[PDB]
Structure 1
Amino acid sequence: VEPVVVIDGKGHLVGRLASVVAKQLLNGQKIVVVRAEELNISGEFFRNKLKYHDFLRKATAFNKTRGPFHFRAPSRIFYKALRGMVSHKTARGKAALERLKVFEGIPPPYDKKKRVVVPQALRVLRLKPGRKYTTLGKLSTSVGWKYEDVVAKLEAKRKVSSAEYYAKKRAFTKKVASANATAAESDVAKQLAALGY
């Protein structure tokens, strides 16, 4: 219900994460997807490996440039599973997509804001315990995208830059928590209970 919805990508299914996004982009709800390389796919690591190559070789014969492209990056392999859902030929599906922006890891502006999840996506609430899964990073790093470890570095960086944060944020609430209870018992506190709050 907010101007720019920031979806965190960890713990999601490439299929069922995009399916809700494709509709949330036709309602005029802006989205920026972040931390893609931890996104997941049903089935084992080897299936997706050959879910892919058989699409990797589909390039048009008489010239390779103008054939169907193949994007190795962790983003686009999601962004390809998305742009198919939206129908983009008529101008609606074109200007509709620029509501959407995809990223790997996190970009500079959009880490500072609260990062959400979609209840019906997560690998934890769908797949059966004991079933396998595939980390899209593990996939795209193997099928010829490059930079994963360099992205894994920045993640292993900002986690620390956000670590000192949470302490200063929590320790602040530690004051306010009992300070929420230091004003209790008062004649106004008895009424808020009768008033429900």
Structure 2
Amino acid sequence: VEPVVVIDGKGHLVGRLASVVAKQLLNGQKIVVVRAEELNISGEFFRNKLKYHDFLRKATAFNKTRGPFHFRAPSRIFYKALRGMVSHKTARGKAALERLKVFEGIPPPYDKKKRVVVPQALRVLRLKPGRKYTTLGKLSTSVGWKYEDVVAKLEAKRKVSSAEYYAKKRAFTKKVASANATAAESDVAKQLAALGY
């Protein structure tokens, strides 16, 4: 419902998140996905690695140049499995796949905006516990994406800065959240409690 949702990938799956992000594009809600590294998939790391490689052996015989390509940075794997679900031939899809912006991590200025999640794609809810799964950043690192170590280094930066802010804010709130207690019990407060708040 926001003009632009900033959606988190952590703890989600692909197929489910992909589908949803898609349809939301086709209805015209802009989306910026973030922290792609953190994405998950059904199946152990083996099975997924195999399916990916079995996608690495699909090429074009006369020349590879316009034949099947292969992509690594998790943003691009997600992006793939998503774009398969949009009709990108027509001008509808191409007008949609412009509304989608995937990242890895949380680049500015999306750190400072509230992230959201998709409750029907979360792993913790969907998958039955005690059953294997896979993290994406791993898989993509083992298909040749090199930058994983950097990503951590950047988040271990953000998360620190994050933790500072979240501290001070909470601290501030303790004033207001306590302050209200004196404005309580007064007449006007009695009413606002009687009028349903």
TM-score (norm 2): 0.98
Write the distance in 1 (CA, Å) between the matches of 2:180 and 2:134. Answer: 45
Write the distance in 2 (CA, Å) between the matches of 1:108 and 1:145. Answer: 22
Write the distance in 2 (CA, Å) between the matches of 1:161 and 1:193. Answer: 39
Deviation at 1:95, TM superposition (A): 1.4
SS in 2 for 1:21: helix
SS in 2 for 1:58: coil
SS in 2 for 1:85: coil
SS in 1 for 2:125: coil
SS in 1 for 2:7: strand
Write the distance in 2 (CA, Å) between the matches of 1:56 and 1:166. Answer: 44
Deviation at 1:33, TM superposition (A): 0.2
Deviation at 1:31, TM superposition (A): 0.2
Deviation at 1:57, TM superposition (A): 1.1
Unaligned runs of 5+ in 2: none
SS in 1 for 2:192: helix
Write the distance in 2 (CA, Å) between the matches of 1:116 and 1:144. Answer: 30
Write the distance in 1 (CA, Å) between the matches of 2:172 and 2:133. Answer: 39
Cα deviation code 1:11-44 (max 9, x no counterpart): 1001111111111001110000000001000010
Moved over 3 A (4+): none
Deviation at 1:149, TM superposition (A): 0.5
Write the distance in 2 (CA, Å) between the matches of 1:153 and 1:62. Answer: 42
Aligned to 1:16: 16
Deviation at 1:194, TM superposition (A): 1.1
Unaligned runs of 5+ in 1: none
Aligned to 1:69: 69
* Paired residues for 1:8-157 under 5 Å: 8-157=8-157
Cα deviation code 1:45-67 (max 9, x no counterpart): 00000010000110111111110
SS in 2 for 1:113: coil
Identity %: 100
Deviation at 1:110, TM superposition (A): 1.1
Write the distance in 1 (CA, Å) between the matches of 2:27 and 2:181. Answer: 42
TM-score (norm 1): 0.98
Deviation at 1:180, TM superposition (A): 2.0
